[PDB]
Ligand binder design. Structure first.
Ligand code: QOK
Length: 157
């Protein structure tokens, strides 16, 4: 029977962060770079949500997905707290990291592989060389460089 709606959360969890930042008029705008990655992870997840045959996502499979949603839940969670101009700064003050999703970047990866096993065994996909790789956290530093200026520009009208 499977849960059904539960699976949907797996995908929505990703888009949620993409749309969440889209509205936020703060540094979150840069998150678009990190979101673009996760957005591609849910791509294949949607195909399963609606296939050309009565699917049967056992619990064993749902387990992995459940771990993925956890990664996205955090990404959006931290952002929600940065909704306040005073909060976003208050955190950064004790964050000691220009990047907001520095650790989250890895989390989404550690949890992603969890599904890669089911996607490679079922979907028969590589799920690794395409998205995953070696340069991930470093890429953030690139965009972060601009984020710093975003705080300065605030001064001028
Ligand atoms: C508060 N404090 C911040 C920031 C920020 O964006 N960056 C890059 C920082 O380094 N620090 C210390 N914010 C959020 O920006 C304030 C928005 O006001 C317009």
């Amino acid at each position: 029977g499977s849960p059904g709606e539960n699976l949907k959360h797996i995908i929505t969890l990703g888009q949620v962060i993409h749309k969440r930042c889209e509205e936020m008029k703060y540094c979150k705008k840069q998150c678009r770079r990190l979101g673009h990655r996760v957005l591609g992870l849910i791509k294949p997840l949607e195909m399963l949500q609606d296939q050309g045959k009565r699917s049967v996502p056992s619990e064993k499979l749902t387990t992995a997905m459940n771990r993925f949603k956890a990664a996205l839940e955090e990404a959006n969670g931290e952002i929600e707290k940065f909704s306040n101009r005073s909060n976003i700064c208050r955190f950064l003050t004790a964050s000691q990291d220009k990047i907001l999703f520095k650790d989250v970047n890895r989390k989404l990866s550690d949890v992603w592989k969890e599904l890669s096993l089911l996607l490679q065994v079922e979907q028969r996909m590589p799920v690794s060389p395409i998205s995953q790789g070696a340069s991930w956290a470093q890429e953030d530093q690139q965009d972060a460089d601009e984020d710093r200026r975003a705080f300065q520009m605030l001064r001028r009208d």
